[PDB]
Amino acid sequence: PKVIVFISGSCLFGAISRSLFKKLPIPYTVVLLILGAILGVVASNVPLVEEHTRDVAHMDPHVLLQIFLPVLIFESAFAMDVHTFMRSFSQVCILALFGLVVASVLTAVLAMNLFNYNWNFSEAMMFGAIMSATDPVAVVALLKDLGASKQLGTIIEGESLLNDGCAIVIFNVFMKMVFFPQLTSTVGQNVLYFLQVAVAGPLWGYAVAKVTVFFLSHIFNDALVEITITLAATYLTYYIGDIWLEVSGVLAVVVLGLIVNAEKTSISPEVEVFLHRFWEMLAYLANTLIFMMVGVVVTQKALVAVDKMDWFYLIILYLAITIIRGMVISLFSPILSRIGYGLTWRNAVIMTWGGLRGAVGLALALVVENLAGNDVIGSKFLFHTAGIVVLTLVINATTIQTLLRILGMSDISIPKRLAMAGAVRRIHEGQNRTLNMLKSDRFLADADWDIATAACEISDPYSPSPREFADMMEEARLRMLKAEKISYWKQFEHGMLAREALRLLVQHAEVAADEKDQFILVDDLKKSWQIKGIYPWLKRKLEDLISHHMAFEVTINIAIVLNIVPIIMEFVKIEDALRISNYVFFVIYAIEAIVKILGLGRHYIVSHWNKFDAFILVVALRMLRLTKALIPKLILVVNGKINNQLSLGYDVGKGYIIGEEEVGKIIDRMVDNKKILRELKHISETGRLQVVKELGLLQREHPGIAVSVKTRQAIRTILNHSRETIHELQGAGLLDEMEAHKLELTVEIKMKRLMNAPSSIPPPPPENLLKNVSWLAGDMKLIDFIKARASLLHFDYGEVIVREGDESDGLFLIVSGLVKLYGKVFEDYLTVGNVIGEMGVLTKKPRNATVTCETTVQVYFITAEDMNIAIDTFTLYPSLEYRLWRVVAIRIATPLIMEQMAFQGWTQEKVKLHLERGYLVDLAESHFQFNIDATLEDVILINGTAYNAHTREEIRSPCLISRTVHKLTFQYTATEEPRLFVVRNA
Amino acid sequence: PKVIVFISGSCLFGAISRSLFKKLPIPYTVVLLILGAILGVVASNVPLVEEHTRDVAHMDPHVLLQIFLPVLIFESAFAMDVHTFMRSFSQVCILALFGLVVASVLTAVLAMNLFNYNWNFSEAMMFGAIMSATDPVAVVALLKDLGASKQLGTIIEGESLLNDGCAIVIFNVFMKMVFFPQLTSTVGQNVLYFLQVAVAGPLWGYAVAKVTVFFLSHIFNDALVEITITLAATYLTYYIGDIWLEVSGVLAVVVLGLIVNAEKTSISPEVEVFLHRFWEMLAYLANTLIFMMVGVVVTQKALVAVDKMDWFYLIILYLAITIIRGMVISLFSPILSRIGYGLTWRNAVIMTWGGLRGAVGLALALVVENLAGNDVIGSKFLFHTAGIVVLTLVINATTIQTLLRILGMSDISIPKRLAMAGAVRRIHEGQNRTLNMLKSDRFLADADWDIATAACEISDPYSPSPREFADMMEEARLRMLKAEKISYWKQFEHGMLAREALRLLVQHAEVAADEKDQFILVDDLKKSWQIKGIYPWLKRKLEDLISHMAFEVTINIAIVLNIVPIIMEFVKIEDALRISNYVFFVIYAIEAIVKILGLGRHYIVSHWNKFDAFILVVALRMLRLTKALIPKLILVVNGKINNQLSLGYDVGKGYIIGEEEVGKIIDRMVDNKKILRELKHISETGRLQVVKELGLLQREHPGIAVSVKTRQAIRTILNHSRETIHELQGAGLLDEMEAHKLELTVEIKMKRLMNAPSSIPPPPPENLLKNVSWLAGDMKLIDFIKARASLLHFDYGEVIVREGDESDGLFLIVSGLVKLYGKVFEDYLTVGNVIGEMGVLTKKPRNATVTCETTVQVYFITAEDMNIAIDTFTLYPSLEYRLWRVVAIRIATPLIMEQMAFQGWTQEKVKLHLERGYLVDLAESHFQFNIDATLEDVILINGTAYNAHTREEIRSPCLISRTVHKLTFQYTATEEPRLFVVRNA
């Protein structure tokens, strides 16, 4: 058998038709089919080409059924976006299953009473099933090429996959019924077989996928072991499926592919991209081979047994299948709308014409033709399937192209056009200035400028009247929504916000912008983060109440595993085996009894588990012993299952509140209408307060998960900033490349190890919180002195702690609860770990706020006189006074520098770093004389009065002072010591 | 046959031993071997495991010889650094070949007269050949694990590859001689076979590699076609080599692997990394399988036919092979030193112990054991080879680790330690300030700070007296060299300098720093860029003098058609012959008609047509194809010279810019006059010599230089556009996928540029006059200047203009090289460099002298015409503003550079910084300027400044600091003051 030339020519023709058929809208598979037809007619004429093509044109059905199908289905599974697929699992699954069933039955009942073949009922079901299969890849490809709607692509791909799997299953059972009639089909074993293929396959695939993921989670700095392990696991599942029920192996591999593709943490990205490329290449090879094979086979023998009526019938069949495909979706759209997963007019219209028949139908046609022998049914099946495929693959493509061009999907929004125009203009200006600069140097003044300026051009690829006040409302709304949307992207760019939270926030913003006079709401986000109130909490609640050395328990657990072997023996030369078994059982009994004795020795009390162990010993059922180890793993999986959702909710809330703060700061210099400004500020502040209260309560309800999430966020931010500093240091040429590479490798290893951190860290004790105050930066004498006299207080809900119009009794520290701060317009909520009244004790001013308790609160109280003696006792350079005033100054100075220079490109994190780099300066060594230089950028006066010499102008406080002034002097005031905050350059 | 469980268990054991045997120095293959031994003894005891392992333990020699070897050799070829390998081709090739030959012969003559087997000569030759193999991946692995040197790793890898490639051939021929004695070995056909396996194989591999590369160079935006094409090409070459010579196939695939790995432009990086990973995985699978197989086989049957003396002999054999391996290098080191490719003491010592036997010897032992049948030679061969491998794989590893620890290779230089300490300190400070900032916000005040601060720590992984004049001298020298290297790294980081040029420059800097009191020289760089003077220039010189159009295309096609009858000539037989005759006749007529047509086109017979008429009269179509053969030879010579010229130009430009920066920075480092004078003298002498040499090199042949300059300009513009796109994407102004498609367009443009034509013809002088910086496409200005622009020609050795004279007018060098000398001030100007802009702008007498170093063509414009053209035009983008802006930035770049030459400011950054701003006039400001905070730097070009609250005179040209805030100017008839201010974004 000679086969090499056929495969090499197939690869060559596939590459040629991929390269030279790209601008055309129709796919290259039609060219492949006609090339196969030419090869078939040539081989029918010339005998040598017939000898060279017979070895592959007519090959066994078993190799086709066992290699060409599972690879295609597994690639279709691997090319999925799993999350958007599971977002609409129920809708797509019910639609695919019911539509497949009704389409197959209708096509079978059409083929039975139409035509003149006098076909039976099983042949009708086989014919109906082999053309209900659709193609996932092509539809998603040309939907992504024009229209840009990911929901439609994901639902159509999921429908195609769920159609292909069920079509394969039903075709297989009906072929087994029709071609090998020796089998028996009693109801009991048949329903057992259906239950087996329904439930047993996917469970096995899921189990092996979980085991493989768990094994891969422990591999560090090894990109070659995991690839081999993954391939071996995939083949092992396929082999178990093959030796098992054949119709279930495809289900097992698609389940494993979905599970493996869903997981993205324990697998490094390089392994993922390599696996994607590998399976894509294998599927491409299979597709090319099957198309050429079916072209040759349909041309050689299928087209010499047809008539005029056989050409007449396929048009009717195509019309019928299109009509039923449209009718199913038309009938099922209202139910989907009523339940809450409805579609629209345009999506239904495009999904009616989005059904392309792929290569799986060709494979099943080849199988039925090869099994049919030298009969006519194989020729009819192959001819009809090839005709339907070659019709739809061009007709539906052209129709869907025209439909997209004639509807609103192939349209570009005006803001997108404006953004593209601005980007193109900026690129053109940058290129022009770069060229103008580069024309001036004396080393590159000879190059041909026409070629250089013509071979690098960038072109755009896209080409009191109520009405007045309402128009102001509309433009204000649209501009505010634009600002929020750009802020949520700036947050993601620095790596602070998660991808899913960003997607949800931008989707909500777009939904709010689309609807007229509709602001962004908080109830939808409340639903987004309220998912914790779900039955998993009830599993946790029941499971926690369900509930000498430690090595004894581990050894006993192991002992139980040993007992499993005798069990198997019981389940079961023979004499010797039996004898061994009795001895083994006796030994196990002895061990158990000894274990019980040891337990009694360690403890004489009797418990429920002790009573159960005594009953077990009295019996001499080892499965009842493993629950002791089963329970903690169930706890550990429920912990992560709730931790993921809590993390997502916290990220969404924090992103929304920070973006809203920035947007509220940016509106102040846009429009100058008092009423609209008042309304916008009112809405923003109401949303902010409600969101912060809800997040505070959510954190308070269960603290361990919140503590774990906060720790993970802090660690991630610190590591990201360290990586950025390493990259900046490498870019300046201070160190060699490979040292930076190994440092980045260490950082990446740290991040990967963090990704598998334990969840639900227990909350710290109050002393740990008191040891982590910002100004109490590990000063042993200060820590000891403050811990010596720190009083602890407890207040019930509904009481008032302190009130304004009173002297500063002392600073407070919230160590448990949620406190409402209300005063003079000024409303906010403070939580655990937030000091109260620093400026009250520093400036010796009366209180300017009122404190109320919204839950049971525990606070830390320190007297002000003790603080005063501790601060006038210590006079070191890093004194507590400097730390306190620096913290208060940066806290009071961030909003001022933000609102003064809120130009396009300044965020919260950047301003915080900018103010963090600088440091406070005193007037003792400057003799009350300051001169503003160019090294320092911004200078802000916190409190006091300023003066000059050549202008002599009073300066109110707190105020940032611009660069107009030059010399600053200060008088001697007993009631106030003036302070300044200056920030210098690098 | 059941084979699944064995392969699955092999994969599992390979993964387990890779994971759990990483900190240990010895490789995991010893664990694999002992696991195979345990499996063998278990299968010898239990019958079921014997049934499950017999199907794979004893497999055919043909599948082993035809799959397991070529994959290993091709992976070894693919895992090479080709450029550093070809840097020392001759040394490693002669060393590997001669050492292989002498070691094999000595081992054969040892095995013949030692032992007691009474072996023949063929068996001794095979025995010597099967243990001369070497493991490439292990040596490079343990070398790169420590410091080592790229040179040592590359030479040892090349030697290992060549050793395996020749050992396979010699083993193949001797096995064919010894096991199938029916073959005939007459001298003629034997030497024909040797010539075939020497020359015909690599030529075929090279031809297919070139064809595949040419086909892949035309594929754009398709990452799946090229992978399949590459795999199909590799298999096709393997198949042709396998059916052809069954030994030379390994030579064909190693040549193809080297050629494909060398090429890196027509193949996208994703395809390259995918191919690397694929072949690495296949080789890993093969290695694991062969080690487990040989463990099982050696344990089951090889160890039951040995005695005390059979345990005694292998130690002697190991000592002998180590001794001869050392002796070969010891003898051949002086010759290598004499020719110019010598090694050192430490490299020879480490390369003596760097010979690790790999899996290839195991495969050949399995082949000879399986072919030997139920005899004793197979058992002896397998036992000896397994013993040698299991000895060396631990003994040489431990010995080389101890040797590296006991010599200077495993040492870290003091500057490296200082740099690591500084980087760790900076990282620690950054982490501390980030943590201090993050402890303050009110949304993250609850996280456990101990865990956060303990789970992110970064730790360092490394743990008149001439004496005083001498120590300051050396400290200045190392400071210069450090500045030079960091300047080169800064140049490379922006993407301006090539990788090879950067490597060469840093290597030269390190070499100069290692030698005492040795500055960086220019003669070595002169040798680096003088490679253009080589015999390829002579091929070009002879080839150029050798030297509707659709007719010629048709003529070539006709020649191909004529080839068909020729084939038959070499060859229903009657029918075939008749058809052939008919075709021949027909051909003889189309060619005659084409010749008649040519005659009707050109009456006189052409020089080629003179012999074409004889060709027609004969009725030998190979002589016709030279017409199309010649231009492709011209193109390939053009490319081969273009690469070298580009490398030389890059090296020169990088060195001169780095030297300028290094000369600028040192001015505020040390305060001794004599050393400053000497240092500046050396720097300026080197700069002038390099610039003169580069000018002459550009002048000698202009087309290649023009092409190189155009490529550089296009690359820089595209890189800056990509940077702007990335910055725009980072600010959230546009969505991600639009930026992705723009970057895809930019990448497509870069890839299309990479295949640009070479040797662009030089532009005409009018094109150069149309591309002056201030003549930015102003139609009236261009027409007026082209109306009166005089053109002059001056011979070598004359003086164009001299100082102490009125400004006659600005000049423009359109051809030649001109020396500008005057008042200390010496430089060289080339084509496209305007002369005397400040002379005509400020109406000042000349301050320079011009001499001609070659024949020069210049453009002369009278100053009166410039004056009337400049007082006629008064638009906002006037020529006066452009001229003064260009002169001001040119005169202001060095001042702002030298004033603020802090660590982190380069030429390109300062040029962009000064380019962003623009000049301001005093007409609308009423001679009043007040400095705001938006603008950064302000420089007074010419004139005198005045104040109000200080009233201080300011000399020119001078950048004015942040001391006075109000500037006023008087009305001066002899001078109009100007300022250059640069503002913020």
From Swiss-Prot, chain B:
Positions that bind 3',5'-cyclic AMP: G836, M838, G839, R846, N847
Regulation of its activity: Gated by voltage and stimulated by cyclic nucleotides which shift the activation voltage closer to resting membrane potential. Not inhibited by common sodium:proton exchanger inhibitors such as amiloride.
ATP-binding keyword on record: no
Record topology, Cytoplasmic segments: 23-27, 79-88, 147-149, 219-222, 263-269, 339-344, 408-548, 598-605, 635-985
Record's subcellular location: Cell projection, Cilium, Flagellum membrane
Motif window: Essential for sodium:proton exchange: 163-164
GO biological process, one term: sodium ion import across plasma membrane
Intervals, Extracellular compartment: 46-61, 115-120, 176-186, 246-248, 304-308, 373-376
UniProt-annotated binding residues for 3',5'-cyclic GMP: G836, E837, M838, R846, N847
Region (cNMP-binding domain): 780-861
Region Interacts with the transport core domain, residue ranges: 499-514
Chief location bin: membrane
Stretch list, region Interacts with the S4 segment of voltage sensor domain: 469-514, 672-731
UniProt keyword annotations, A-Z: Antiport, Cell membrane, Cell projection, Cilium, Fertilization, Flagellum, Ion transport, Membrane, Signal, Sodium, Sodium transport, Transmembrane, Transmembrane helix, Transport
GO (cellular component) term, any one: plasma membrane
pH-linked activity: Optimum pH is 6.5.
Any one Gene Ontology molecular-function term assigned to this protein's record: protein homodimerization activity
Membrane topology (UniProt): Multi-pass membrane protein
TM regions (residue ranges): 3-22, 28-45, 62-78, 89-114, 121-146, 150-175, 187-218, 223-245, 249-262, 270-303, 309-338, 345-372, 377-407, 549-571, 572-597
Membership in a protein family: Belongs to the monovalent cation:proton antiporter 1 (CPA1) transporter (TC 2.A.36) family.
Note: The VSD and CNBD domains are not functional in mammalian SLC9 orthologs. In addition, the conserved Asn-Asp/Asp-Asp motif that coordinates sodium ions in NHEs is lacking in mammalian SLC9C1 and SLC9C2, suggesting alternative transport mechanisms and/or substrates.
Assembly information from the UniProt record: Homodimer; the dimerization is stabilized in the presence of phosphatidic acids.
Notes concerning its domains: The dimer domain comprises TM1-TM3 and TM8-TM10 regions. The dimerization interface is formed predominantly by tight interactions between TM1 on one protomer and TM8 on the other. It contains an hydrophobic cavity that accomodates phosphatidic acids likely playing an allosteric role.
Cited function: Electroneutral sodium:proton antiporter that regulates intracellular pH of sperm along with capacitation and fertility. Activated in response to egg-derived chemoattractants, couples membrane voltage to sodium:proton exchange and transduces membrane hyperpolarization to cytoplasmic alkalization to cAMP signaling and ultimately to sperm motility.
Protein name per the record: Sperm-specific sodium:proton exchanger
